[model samples]
Target: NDKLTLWTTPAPSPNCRLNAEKDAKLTLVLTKCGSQILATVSVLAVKGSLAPISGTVQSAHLIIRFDENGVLLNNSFLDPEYWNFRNGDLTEGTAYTNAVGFMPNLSAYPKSHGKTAKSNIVSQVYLNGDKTKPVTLTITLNGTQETGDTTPSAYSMSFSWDWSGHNYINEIFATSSYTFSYIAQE
Candidate 1:
């Protein structure tokens, strides 16, 4: 018997008024596997614009894992407090497929101040397939929210394996495609 934890978070966007910050602690008692022991997790299938799905606002699941060494994971000051608001206007905004997203910087965690971390700058801007220009992203590892450049911040993920031993993965996998979908709101 052993232990494991997977933190989850999902920020839908501007119009979302449901479980936006909702989270759950999934505890797993390591059973057994062939050759070695492994675990995987994924979720989806609820729809909405309201966050945390409260009477109005709610929490949705968002986030992932990775294979990292020499460092941990975290978010940035410019992380998402607001959704994909075109011009900071929630009434009519979709993720800017040009200047907003979550990318990764392969530096050690808690980087020094003003030291620009670099690597694998991914994006919804170029990959979202809705922009005319190419854009890039860097995963900001600041935990507090600040008033700088705002965008989705993806923290590099890590994992503990075989009990007591830790290793990070190189990719995050969704248990399924078409995992989530939401209708436009008025």
Candidate 2:
């Protein structure tokens, strides 16, 4: 029998109640990197209640390790808010290294008098650079809430990078946006 190995882990919980605060966690495993590589990771949290409830991501962290045949290698941690990917890439003729990071954003989607609510997307990315040295990149995000009585806000965040040449590799590139929302609780 042949079995396949899974690279990514599932979120902590799949079901969440409305107006209730819940936390979800995800993991990304860097198994392999080709000559050129680009990857993206994203998280979304939603509320199912009818009352106005605000939610915030409390903690986010990234872990990195290197090794051969899964042997122990160098490990490092990073802040989820803004991470540097180029700094984590593996060096040529060196063992493989894996790095994981977390990003959290605080936002609230208004719930109608008796309707459900949903949040925005929190996303990030990692890229494999050329054999040259790694380049670090960072992104800044800003959000605004609109005024109204029945609008539902949508919040989203994204991270991406391009690594094609030496001395010109793109680093952390990230962006986030939030929609306007307004509603009252029962």
**Local accuracy by lDDT, each model:** 0.23, 0.24
Error of 1 at 132 (Å): 4.1
What's each prediction's TM-score?
0.21, 0.22
What is the clash count of model 1? 38
* Model 2 score (lDDT): 0.24
Model 2, 154-181: lDDT tens digits are 2212122222342221222111221222
Q: Which run of 10 residues does model 1 get worst, by summed lDDT?
A: 177-186
